[PDB]
Design a protein around this nucleic acid. Structure first.
Length: 175
RNA sequence: UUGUGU
């Protein structure tokens, strides 16, 4: 597929970008290798892990299949660990997720799904409940895109008061 | 008790 940056652990600290490029080019073309470094003191030192960006996802998977938990590099006591880099993270759930406050305690997960469905696809909806199963009068709602979330907010924040509630419904991005 | 995933 298209380009992707992988994070790789259990790389010997003595390996440089050049040793790494040779290892990963066995599985697919490599756009870039970047050894994570520690510069707290002299000299700079490898942190025993690197980023490799492959041109294609197919390459990245082929390398993963061949290496992850599979190959133990010279002097290591655990095999290579490889996964997409944190910087590759896209729709972090935490930025499509809404806190819904001041809902009726009789509100069901399905009631909320219904209330917010007209704004997009809801991937998850959960009512916070105490130990006795009683609603805490609030929920979490995750849309597939942040843009849906933002649309729900504009239209639903404080737009009405629900039964037993002392103030209008609260709709905002979750903490 | 405006409650943010035990």
């Amino acid at each position: 597929s298209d380009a992707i940056k992988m994070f790789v652990g259990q790389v010997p600290r003595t390996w440089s970008e050049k040793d790494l490029r040779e290892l990963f080019e066995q599985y697919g073309a490599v756009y870039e290798i970047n050894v994570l470094r520690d510069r707290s003191q002299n000299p700079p030192q490898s942190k025993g892990c690197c980023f490799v960006t492959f041109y294609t996802r197919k390459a990245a998977l082929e390398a993963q299949n061949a290496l992850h938990n599979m190959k133990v590099l010279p002097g290591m006591h655990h095999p290579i660990q490889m996964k997409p880099a944190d910087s590759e993270k896209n729709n972090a759930v935490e930025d499509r997720k809404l806190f819904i406050g001041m809902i009726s305690k009789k509100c069901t997960e399905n009631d909320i799904r219904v209330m917010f469905s007209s704004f997009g696809q809801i991937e998850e909806c959960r009512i916070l409940r105490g130990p006795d199963g009683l609603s805490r009068g609030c929920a979490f709602v995750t849309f597939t895109t942040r843009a849906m979330a933002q649309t729900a907010i504009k239209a639903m924040h404080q737009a009405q008061t629900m039964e037993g509630c002392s103030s209008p419904m609260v709709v905002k991005f979750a903490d």
